[PDB]
Design an enzyme around this catalytic site. Structure first.
Site, PDB file in Angstrom:
ATOM      1  N   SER A 166     -30.033 -69.455  72.784  1.00 56.90           N
ATOM      2  CA  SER A 166     -30.538 -70.373  73.786  1.00 56.90           C
ATOM      3  C   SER A 166     -32.026 -70.662  73.606  1.00 56.90           C
ATOM      4  O   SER A 166     -32.446 -71.234  72.601  1.00 56.90           O
ATOM      5  CB  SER A 166     -30.271 -69.794  75.184  1.00 56.90           C
ATOM      6  OG  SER A 166     -30.183 -70.806  76.175  1.00 56.90           O
ATOM      7  N   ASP A 179     -20.244 -76.661  77.921  1.00 54.14           N
ATOM      8  CA  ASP A 179     -21.432 -75.902  78.295  1.00 54.14           C
ATOM      9  C   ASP A 179     -22.204 -76.612  79.408  1.00 54.14           C
ATOM     10  O   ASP A 179     -22.811 -77.655  79.172  1.00 54.14           O
ATOM     11  CB  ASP A 179     -22.308 -75.737  77.050  1.00 54.14           C
ATOM     12  CG  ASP A 179     -23.478 -74.815  77.269  1.00 54.14           C
ATOM     13  OD1 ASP A 179     -23.675 -74.338  78.402  1.00 54.14           O
ATOM     14  OD2 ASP A 179     -24.213 -74.573  76.293  1.00 54.14           O
ATOM     15  N   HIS A 210     -22.531 -70.743  77.789  1.00 53.68           N
ATOM     16  CA  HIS A 210     -23.796 -70.926  77.098  1.00 53.68           C
ATOM     17  C   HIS A 210     -24.136 -69.680  76.280  1.00 53.68           C
ATOM     18  O   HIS A 210     -25.209 -69.601  75.693  1.00 53.68           O
ATOM     19  CB  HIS A 210     -24.897 -71.256  78.126  1.00 53.68           C
ATOM     20  CG  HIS A 210     -26.131 -71.866  77.535  1.00 53.68           C
ATOM     21  ND1 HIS A 210     -26.143 -73.124  76.975  1.00 53.68           N
ATOM     22  CD2 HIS A 210     -27.399 -71.399  77.434  1.00 53.68           C
ATOM     23  CE1 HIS A 210     -27.361 -73.403  76.544  1.00 53.68           C
ATOM     24  NE2 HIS A 210     -28.142 -72.372  76.808  1.00 53.68           N
TER      25      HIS A 210
END
Ligand code: NA
Length: 273
Positions: A101, A224, A252
């Site tokens: 991320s 997502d 995610h």
């Protein structure tokens, strides 16, 4: 220039742990409100091929809070300093960085300062920016909803965690998993969490992408809440030398829910880049 601490110094500061073996080294960087323990699903396969290095961002997990500052860690550039300092201090070269991320962006910032020690970046469920700039960029999050999220952190922290954990993990997943994320959120210092959340969901690093010259492998989650396929697509188009793979999965956190889907692919990328 990049500060060079004693190897001994960054190790304790960033709770660095080294496993596996072999000449090829990978560095794993966790995402918002997490720590190095979220890599445990991938570690075993990674350790069969590489020397694996994990760490905790200052302020995160079991890192040394004595090193945390709201000034330095107000933006992702301070997090990138963490990475740059670990790489300089361990004098590592030819490192493959695997980021989750936000660490996708952090690793990329770091690659603009110490690109000479980084061979490639793997970006798991990345986003350059969560806000919307229609029509040509839709991060997927209205300013009003983001304002409400950050404010919920002030009103009701436990409430904030209960809301964001399923958002990030993907609501279709197990209570064990979702619950692991809300627990991590909860045990993270509230000032670290609040300044990290602003640096993560309130920043805009789209202009960075064209300046990332390092080869980048992007994994886009098919479903997502935090980043649609158009976000991943946007990134690949703008990172000069990049490659996106779309993954049939939800949430995610593919490194945790679908390690089996992405691991062989990123291993092949790191071995043959
Ligand atoms: Na290799």
């Amino acid at each position: 220039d990049v500060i060079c601490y004693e190897k001994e110094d960054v190790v304790k500061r960033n709770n660095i742990n080294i496993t596996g073996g072999g000449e090829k080294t990978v560095l794993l960087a966790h995402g918002f409100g997490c720590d190095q323990n979220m890599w445990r699903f991938m570690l075993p396969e990674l350790e069969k091929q590489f020397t694996v290095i994990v760490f905790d961002y200052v302020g995160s997990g079991q890192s040394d809070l004595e090193s945390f500052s709201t000034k330095r860690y107000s933006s992702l550039e301070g997090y990138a300093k963490d990475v740059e300092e670990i790489l300089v201090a361990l004098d590592l070269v030819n490192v493959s960085i695997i980021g989750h991320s936000v660490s996708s962006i952090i690793a990329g910032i770091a690659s603009t300062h110490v690109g000479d020690r980084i061979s490639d970046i793997t970006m798991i469920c990345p986003s350059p920016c969560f806000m919307n700039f229609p029509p040509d960029y839709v991060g997927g999050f209205e300013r009003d909803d983001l304002e409400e999220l950050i404010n919920l952190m002030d009103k009701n922290y436990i409430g904030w965690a209960n809301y964001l954990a399923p958002l990030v993990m993907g609501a279709s997943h197990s209570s064990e998993l979702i619950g692991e994320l809300s627990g991590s959120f909860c045990t993270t210092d509230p000032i670290v969490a609040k300044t990290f959340a602003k640096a993560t969901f309130f920043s805009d690093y789209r202009s960075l992408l064209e300046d990332i010259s390092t080869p980048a492998l992007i994994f886009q989650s098919a479903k997502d809440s935090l980043a649609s396929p158009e976000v991943g697509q946007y990134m690949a188009e703008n990172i000069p030398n990049s490659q996106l793979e779309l993954i049939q999965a939800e949430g995610h956190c593919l490194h945790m829910t679908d390690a089996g889907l992405i691991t062989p692919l990123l291993i092949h990328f790191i071995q043959n880049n």
